[PDB]
Amino acid sequence: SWFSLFITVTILVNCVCMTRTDLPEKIEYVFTVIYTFEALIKILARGDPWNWLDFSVITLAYVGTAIDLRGISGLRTFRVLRALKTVSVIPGLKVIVGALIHSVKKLADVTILTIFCLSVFALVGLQLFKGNLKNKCVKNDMAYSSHRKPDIYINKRGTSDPLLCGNGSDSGHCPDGYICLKTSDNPDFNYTSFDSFAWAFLSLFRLMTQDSWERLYQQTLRTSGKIYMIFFVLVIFLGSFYLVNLILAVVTMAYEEQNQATWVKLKTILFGLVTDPFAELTITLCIVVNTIFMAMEHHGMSPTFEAMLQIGNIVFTIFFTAEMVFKIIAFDPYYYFQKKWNIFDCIIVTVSLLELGVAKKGSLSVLRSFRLLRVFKLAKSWPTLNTLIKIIGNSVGALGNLTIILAIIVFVFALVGKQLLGENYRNNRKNISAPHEDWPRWHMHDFFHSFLIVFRILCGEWIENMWACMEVGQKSICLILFLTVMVLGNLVVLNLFIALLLNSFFADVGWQVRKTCYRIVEHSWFESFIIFMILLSSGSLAFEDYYLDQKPTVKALLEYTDRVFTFIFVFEMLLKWVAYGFKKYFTNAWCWLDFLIVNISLISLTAKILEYSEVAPIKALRTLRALRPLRALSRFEGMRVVVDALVGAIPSIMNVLLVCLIFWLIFSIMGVNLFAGKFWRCINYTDGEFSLVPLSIVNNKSDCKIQNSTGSFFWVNVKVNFDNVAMGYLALLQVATFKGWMDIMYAAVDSREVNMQPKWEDNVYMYLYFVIFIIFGGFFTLNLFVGVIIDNFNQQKKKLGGQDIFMTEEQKKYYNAMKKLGSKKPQKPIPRPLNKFQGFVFDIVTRQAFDITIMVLICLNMITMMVETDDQSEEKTKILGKINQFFVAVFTGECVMKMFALRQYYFTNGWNVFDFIVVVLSIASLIFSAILKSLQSYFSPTLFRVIRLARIGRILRLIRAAKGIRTLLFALMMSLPALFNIGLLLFLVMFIYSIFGMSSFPHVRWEAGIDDMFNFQTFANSMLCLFQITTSAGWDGLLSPILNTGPPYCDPNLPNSNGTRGDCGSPAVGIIFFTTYIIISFLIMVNMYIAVILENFNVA
């Protein structure tokens, strides 16, 4: 076995060699002699595509190793790729890797479709928004070469970016003395644009993955107008929502297919050994009370309060120690230390005694939260927490290999990134650094920050760091590295998620008037009238905006209308009372809701007729009018079905919600132990701009008091902090949703002891807190959540006899009919024309060569539209227009050729009539541009842009060729009807929350997420923000201004205002508004995914 020893030591030293990742170059050359030593032996002894590569690696390493006058650090890459030998060494990873390539082989159809949609939407965005991202708010001149004194801009408040502008009515206006001019450079670093097919394709690829897409949304709306939100509604839905669902499906059957194929002491000991059950109940109560005590500490604790916590902690620790000692003297330590749980209990308690021994205030705070680990002891009676434990265990058990390969991928990518881009970050660190700072917060100088960049990429935030690296280094390596990490890591993480999901979870006179009233209430016209009344009453709410006071007549109009509606609904309730009868009416679960709404309306009306309309309880019931639209769900059956589906799934959601609250309680208690009271800073607030005061001045809260000479210093705190367990839940929500977590991370790593100014990255290893939090509390908790939703949905489906929920019976028959549509293969080829002349065109067009050459011509035209760019030339546009005329002539010729041969059967097939619409639309666009160009009325140039959108139909003609694309879009159009009902529910919720925001949040300071275009002063502005946060994008930015409660941010003393007497939004209402909305929207989107994915299986 000496040969075995030889091979098992050389691979070990080789793997250890690259684990040397640190910067110092103290000992690297000695390893070359071992390389040469092991190289010689293998060939002389003379006793796979990868193995051939392996032979080559030793030769190329020897070539690299001979004379090293110049090093570009490339030589390191060949040895970092040597590490992948260990992948083949362990038996497990081989089959898992083979399965991974297998999923990629089946991703081919989705990839083609995704690229096609991205190209189509990139072309649309290029046509519509070319050069829009070049406008800026430019100072005008007092008084003349082509270039005056350079164009001085204005910064958007709270940022260093120049202000964006537009000449449109709903685009965005500069302040007094500024004009909207098209500048020469683009917003971010001149990389975010629609000025070319490449830039637009990058922007649409960013949109598809929703990585900071809110910035693009706001910029293009600020530069083009609010009406262009229809673009993002289409892109987010079609691009993001669908193609990810296609990926999620394809990974499912690909993976699912793989596993489917496969003396005195004795009497005392005996008494101790026998234990009453009522002995463990006390254990449970002490555990619960101990966690309740630990969840009660905060920042401003009184000395008696901390004393209470200390005495409680000592009482509990000794009690568990007593339980331990009794239990060891009950059994024998041989049999006692066999059980899987008792050893856990022992290690936990002993750590607590060790801490009692070494008790310093701040000594191992993380280990202080080690006694939180006994909360999992309540798993023998809580089945769901037990399933969570089994999930976490399967993550390193039956599915250890996937975690191992994920770790290898992260390690290799981080190390290669360091070796390649490391120096470039440090030397050119000055352009990627913050205005007042000296380093970027995310770089690759050392291994740890490189790993952080890779982890953040895996979390879905890759494009900003890509901009930074492209600014600091060489663009090519940046593209390759960031895109490869994104795709490969996301693939591996998604595969791991699905793998965990599958195996774990799935292993007289009054009587006659009563009768007539019953006739009235069930008459169809009455129902239609009532529905119309609900629609009008709901729509009238969308007019009580910020400017309603400035409009005097419509205010009284809405007054009289709401009075007549509330009288109408009182009358309607009386008819239902007199017809249906009291007992049934109060046992309906819908009439109860309508009755409550009309109660609120009536109380508000009487209290307003009376002079009690400003007392707060009535003023708070006036805000509850936003619930009026909740009367529609009982009317339209689709929303009724969707609501029933949600209610049927609510109970299990409650259980898993409790489990996640417990787990996040553990993490939040740890966070309070680590961070509480440490996020306070001092800022130089002058006018909408603050700057972290340098440590050369204060370093203290006391000094911030003395150096308050200019009256601009403020000892403020981070708005979402870790001072309580409740605030800790908000912080964990922001971190797990990946929105707003940046500021939390920054304040955490900058933290120090209490009452001193934060210092740059003084706690760089507190990043590990958030890494662990994501890995466990986000990943596995979402795993458990999704698993229970899937199981519950399966239960609902079987309960109704295996049918499809979310669909009305009319939509059901539509479903069966359109399914029958998709499977009718034969068509009885049309007759052959008798006339020789009529015949000639028939047998020339019917042959496949004509179709093929027309497809090639369509691809050529797509290429000709790909080369369009902003600010190209006069000549380029002239030639491109001539070629466009050539193509439109060719396609009108093909249309007239087919139409004359196929006389009546031409329109029978849908693709030919669709082609007819495309060609007639192209002719119409051409002639319309010709007439409406400067020869006649000169409307805005933006009209030309939308007219020239008619050529995209020629590109969409290619869908007829791709069979896989034609089947996936078939799956879409079959899944559409259920998505209609779910979207109706989502729109209803969005409307209700829009009304709530338009009443609750319209007087706030313009800040991070709220400005003159995205605020709650108007129904359109509210709907923009609510659509933006439907995907949770940037909800931190809108919540931030509402959390404000005074100076220096808000002004609580504003005479002009009638609400809070200032800006000073309401934090309590603010939290409930946004936090609830994201969960409901998330809960809805899961059902939408489930609706989409099941249709995919039936297609397959």
Ligand SMILES: CCCCCCCC/C=C\CCCCCCCC(=O)OC[C@H](COP(=O)(O)OCC[N+](C)(C)C)OC(=O)CCCCCCC/C=C\CCCCCCCC
């Ligand atoms: C928040 C959200 C707000 C609202 C957002 C808007 C939602 C828009 C939603 C959807 C729009 C597109 C959905 C319809 C797509 C229709 C494609 C289509 O219906 O074709 C497929 C059929 C298949 O037939 P098969 O024989 O292959 O059977 C397939 C064999 N099996 C049974 C195995 C599958 O073909 C046929 O029925 C031939 C007859 C039809 C001929 C004209 C139909 C095509 C016209 C336009 C399609 C363009 C779609 C563009 C999508 C976006 C691209 C960027």
Ligand SMILES: CCCCCCCCCCCCCCCCCCOC[C@@H](O)COP(=O)(O)OCC[N+](C)(C)C
């Ligand atoms: C299978 C069964 C499992 C079910 C488990 C359910 C059991 C739930 C039991 C919950 C128990 C609740 C315990 C709560 C403890 C009481 C809550 C603890 O109260 C302590 C505070 O009120 C003391 O406040 P101070 O008055 O000291 O305030 C400061 C003092 N100065 C500074 C003003 C002078």
Ligand SMILES: *[C@@H]1O[C@H](CO)[C@@H](O[C@@H]2O[C@H](CO)[C@@H](O)[C@H](O)[C@H]2NC(C)=O)[C@H](O)[C@H]1NC(C)=O
């Ligand atoms: C520095 O001085 C300014 C003004 O002298 C202080 O600003 C006051 O802040 C308090 C609340 O902390 C408000 O009630 C006052 O209305 C503010 N005054 C003015 C004029 O704006 C600020 O608090 C001081 N900062 C520190 C750290 O001492």
Ligand SMILES: COc1cc(NC(=O)c2ccc(-c3ccc(Cl)cc3)o2)cc(OC)c1
């Ligand atoms: C039905 O509502 C929709 C959802 C989406 N989905 C997304 O884009 C997305 C990504 C991540 C999250 C997301 C993550 C966490 C929480 Cl708590 C909430 C949401 O949503 C898309 C839609 O198209 C209109 C509609």
